[PDB]
């Protein structure tokens with residue numbers, strides 16, 4: 143209930159404060175993925191294979207910095223809002239229930 | 252594609268979905284009534300006062 | 313709290329599709345109707361009988377009642 | 393001769409729970425004795441019973457039954473609970489009797 | 494307190510645990526749609542009832558015309574009057590299907606839910622009975638007269654209880670005014686007891702058509718049953734309105750379009766369709782006292798059902814013998830209904846006693862007997 147709630151917040155009411163912090167966490171994250179030779183090498187192998195070139199931290203940072211509240215909301219709305227999700231549940235899941243109910247958690251903040 | 256347009260413009264946002272129902276109702280009523288009344292009177296030609304009214308409506312004594 | 317305390321269930325997997333990925337009334341002729349017929353068939357001789365019997369009793373009793381209202385000529389054959 | 397057996401096998405098919413893939417014992421109303429009996433069932437028997445039942449309810453909400461092939465055959469119906477249930481009732485009657493004395 | 498306010502709040506929590514997050518069997522059929530229809534039926538009677546009450550006058554000298562005034566002058570008075578009068582039948586149709594379902598699926602094993610249910614039925618009957626007198630037409634007065642006099646047959650306290658109820662020596666104005674008060678009151682008792690009905694019910698949850706535990710497969714009431722029930726509402730509501738709008742008097746007695754007259758007995762004093770079956774049983778026993786008991790018993794018999802269950806299975810789904818016995822009973826009731834609308838003459842008199850006799854035999858003797866028999870045929 144709370145989780146889907148947070149997704150709905152993303153689409154409808156993200157704050158510049160939130161993104162401002164999310165961006166710093168993301169920067170630290172990308173930088174942290176290049177901590178060593180194996181991880182830098184892993185990046186290269188992938189970037190080439192997937193983007194057909196290397197995307198430097200300098201570029202990532204450029205892109206990451208252009209992101210703002212308004213943008214997060216639009217992108218999220220575009221991929222999350224009122225979408226039929228895919229669900230996998232394993233274990234003692236009796237208390238989680240009904241695709242229908244979950245599907246409804248997909249709209250209205 | 253109307254369905255897609257309808258979806259994007261009307262049914263996606265809950266606010267617009269309500270606005271569509273209200274505006275939809277206002278228009279549905281107007282049309283639906285006129286139509287039903289239209290059907291009822293045709294199926295009853297010359298039987299309703301509306302129909303015979305002229306005979307005593309400023310045409311007697 | 314009634315969800316989560318119901319039953320001890322193990323090893324059952326279930327697969328379901330969103331309502332928007334599927335049809336509301338699928339296979340009306342290949343699955344639906346056949347079954348409707350199947351269901352009707354399996355019950356008709358359990359429900360129908362007593363209702364048919366009721367009908368007969370009703371018809372008899374209604375006719376037997378109107379018949380007793382008519383006059384029997386055998387009460388006036390010697391009323392000269 | 394085989395009269396009682398002709399009748400039973402007949403009622404069994406007349407009943408029709410076998411069309412859902414349920415065993416006779418799956419159809420028992422869960423009163424007090426039956427509930428205790430069920431707690432004594434070995435895990436595997438219990439989980440099988442559970443699936444059979446869940447399956448039946450799903451068929452029931454769908455207004456379908458199993459294909460004639462999958463129907464439980466009179467002679468292949470396993471009376472998995474009757475043994476436990478009889479013991480539970482035996483125990484209960486003992487206590488009832490004893491608490492009277 | 495808690496994450497979502499649908500669980501924490503002292504009120505929503507109630508609305509949630511009974512109409513939204515309430516666990517329902519995934520396989521309950523259309524026969525389970527009658528409870529909600531009964532509830533909606535009740536809200537509608539109370540509603541149309543109040544709207545009519547605001548124009549009614551409980552006095553022998555004004556009753557009949559106050560109702561006519563309502564139909565003839567009040568804006569949509571005729572519609573409301575129709576809906577209320579016809580709603581009473583919709584109510585009973587729904588209640589007989591509600592009861593049937595429970596008998597066929599052994600819902601009565603939920604003793605308290607069942608007993609509060611019988612009380613709801615008795616209160617509903619008293620309500621409709623006293624409501625029927627209000628227009629003060631011929632059948633209003635004579636029905637009141639016939640039925641209330643039956644009780645002067647109770648030993649010793651007979652005449653007393655009756656004259657007390659009438660507030661005099663015959664059905665007259667003081668009876669009408671107290672019947673209006675009662676008719677206004679009882680529906681509220683029905684609403685109250687209904688809450689108890691559902692409270693006991695929630696202790697166990699719903700039974701289902703296969704009569705086996707559905708804990709392995711439960712679904713939230715909403716949206717599954719909120720939608721199923723709303724659909725069930727419009728499906729029934731169509732025949733209802735079709736009747737109330739295209740054939741307003743199909744079920745009513747023409748005799749009631751004549752003001753009550755104590756000096757003119759109608760030729761055929763008979764009740765509304767939903768009471769006919771009981772009227773038949775009444776007349777089956779020639780002897781004022783026995784008939785009254787027989788009448789009372791025709792409905793009180795419902796309190797015994799929970800005690801006459803012998804089957805090892807809950808429902809009759811997998812009990813072919815019990816199933817035919819069940820439809821015999823239903824057919825038996827159509828016959829009694831029919832007999833109840835006929836004059837007391839041959840062949841109707843004998844047929845009446847046969848159907849009355851088989852009615853009680855089937856519930857008291859056959860059902861429990863066939864049940865046991867079937868237990869033997871399952872090798873139990």
Ligand code: HEM
Nearest residue numbers: 525527528529531532600601607610611613614687699700
């Ligand atoms: C004003 C009348 C009544 C109201 C408003 C009412 C309402 C309800 C409701 C809403 C339910 C749940 C939905 C359903 O299963 O249909 C219910 C269930 C039930 N009611 Fe009633 N009821 C009424 C009368 C009665 C009567 C007369 C009986 C029987 C004598 C009765 C017996 C039951 C039982 C045993 C259940 C359990 C259903 C099951 O097997 O799951 N009710 N009722």
Ligand code: HEM
Nearest residue numbers: 538539542543545546549578581621624625627628677680
């Ligand atoms: C359980 C719900 C109710 C039932 C079963 C019911 C039943 C009836 C019946 C059978 C009649 C006679 C119909 C006819 O004219 O042929 C009647 C009349 C009437 N009822 Fe109700 N009623 C109910 C609730 C109410 C309530 C709550 C009120 C309002 C407080 C009310 C007020 C009236 C009035 C004023 C009449 C007399 C006018 C008329 O005959 O239409 N009723 N009712």
Ligand SMILES: CO/C=C(/C(=O)OC)c1ccccc1Oc1cc(Oc2ccccc2C#N)ncn1
Nearest residue numbers: 621622625636637763764765768771772788789792
């Ligand atoms: C005031 O009379 C109201 C009548 C009515 O049908 O209201 C709906 C009525 C009209 C004509 C003749 C009798 C009438 O009343 C009744 C009342 C009645 O009440 C019972 C129903 C079931 C079980 C016991 C009783 C009693 N007493 N059973 C049959 N007819």
